[PDB]
Structure 1
């Protein structure tokens, strides 16, 4: 009896170049149970095109699922992955690691 929390790994796929498209990699690993709500956002708005990989087993019971958009960073931007889950419940606004 132990509930595994989603480990946040919200990194830049492409380099964070001003006024040029960039894919987010909200790589959410180890969410038990599988019933997660990764409702990722852009500058406050909701992304009605959540592209999702596979609920894949890292080592039989740890789900490494990528939730990737393609956002257009301007300059004074602020993208964020929304990580709600049965463990967390609350709106956990992850701050995208562009400074990486």
Structure 2
């Protein structure tokens, strides 16, 4: 009966190391609205901005979580989402060809 979120993790601009880009976690198609979304640096929570809750024609919600980030060689980036539709938090890793 809950609807499960779909997740995309991506960067604003085609990624290169050294350059400071923007890390995005787009989470959409879910219901009910309460949800926990975190952008993670090497497993540890980054400070982040979250968009104003809105929804689609079928009443399912969508959210964008986003932060300044600088790609490197050593550091892993993931997005962790927990929602009542999920048995436990799901994490999706950032991969410079989403």
Q: State the TM-score bracket (shorter-chain normalisation).
A: 0.7 to 0.9
The aligned runs of 1:3-14 (5 Å cut-off) are 3-14=2-13
Question: Which residue number in structure 2 is paired with residue 90 of structure 1?
Answer: 88
Question: Which residue number in structure 1 is paired with residue 79 of structure 2?
Answer: 81
5+ residue gaps, structure 1 = none
Cα deviation code 1:45-71 (max 9, x no counterpart): 211x22111211211511111001111
Question: Which residue number in structure 1 is paired with residue 23 of structure 2?
Answer: 24
Question: Which residue number in structure 2 is paired with residue 43 of structure 1?
Answer: 42
Give how far 1:97 is off: 3.0
Question: Which residue number in structure 2 is paired with residue 67 of structure 1?
Answer: 65
5+ residue gaps, structure 2 = none
Provide runs of 4+ in structure 1 moved above 3 Å: none
Give how far 1:89 is off: 4.2
More strand by share: 2
The Cα RMSD (Å) is: 1.5
CA distance, structure 2, for counterparts of residue 94 and residue 77 of structure 1: 15
What TM-score, normalized to structure 2? 0.88
